[PDB]
Design a protein around this ligand. Structure first.
Ligand SMILES: *C/C=C(C)/C=C/C=C(C)/C=C/C1=C(C)CCCC1(C)C
Length: 230
């Protein structure tokens, strides 16, 4: 087994348990609004499970030549992110009843953020690799700027419980997402300070926090039910 195989195994298992758990809890939820939250936050770990499973199953990796060495890049994980980051932002958008314009902008930027990062990951030219990372971080910064701007995220309209859940969920999102570029930077595709193994491990831990942790936080909320948010 390759050093990083165990963290791909861990992620697969962890996501599968989360998917099954959320799905089970949601099966008894008949509220129209809450069912939507269960739907999105069940789908997110399901996708992660499927994509990590592909890696585990010997698909979803591409080799990229870096500094004379071949790096096994998990392209399947980028395809996961490309799908789940917009869904997670859709959850935040729904919590604060954001406009269509704002929701679509967030979703767009998330997709672009991951597309750029994946382009970076597959670049053999170090200068182009950095550039793609930089452009991706700019999309991430734009997302965070939108989330943080209190004029754009009108909260005055929310019930206390709902506002609190939003604040917690937004804080978690910003804390976690901000860490992804730093792991990338320190890993084999960036500075090469941290081995691939450690990099994979740290990403799996973020992913679990970002999907399972975030899912548990929102789904355990009293504020996702009809007439409970506004
Ligand atoms: C469920 C998975 C989640 C929430 C993944 C989030 C991933 C990111 C925020 C990734 C960001 C990146 C950059 C801003 C720089 C380029 C490399 C990326 C794609 C790791």
């Amino acid at each position: 087994m390759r050093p990083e195989s165990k963290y791909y195994e861990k992620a697969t298992e962890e996501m599968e348990k989360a998917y099954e758990e959320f799905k089970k809890k949601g099966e008894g939820v008949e509220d129209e609004e809450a069912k939507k939250f269960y739907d999105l936050l069940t789908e997110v770990p399901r996708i992660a499970y499927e994509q990590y499973k592909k890696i585990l199953d010997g698909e979803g990796i591409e080799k990229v030549e870096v500094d004379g060495k071949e790096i096994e890049v998990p392209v399947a994980r980028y395809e996961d992110w490309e799908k789940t980051t917009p869904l997670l932002l859709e959850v935040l958008a729904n919590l604060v009843d954001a406009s269509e314009e704002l929701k679509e902008k967030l979703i767009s930027k998330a997709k672009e953020m991951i597309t750029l990062g994946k382009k970076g990951a597959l670049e053999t030219d170090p200068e182009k690799r950095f550039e793609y990372w930089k452009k991706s971080t700019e999309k991430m910064n734009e997302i965070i700027d939108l989330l943080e701007n209190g004029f754009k995220e009108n909260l005055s309209s929310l019930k206390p419980e709902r506002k609190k859940t939003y604040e917690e969920a937004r804080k978690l999102t910003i804390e976690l997402w901000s860490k992804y570029p730093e792991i990338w930077k320190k890993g084999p595709l960036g500075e090469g300070k941290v081995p691939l193994e450690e990099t994979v491990k740290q990403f799996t831990e973020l992913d679990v926090s970002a999907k399972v942790g975030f899912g548990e936080l929102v789904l355990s909320s009293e504020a996702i039910y009809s007439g409970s948010g506004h």
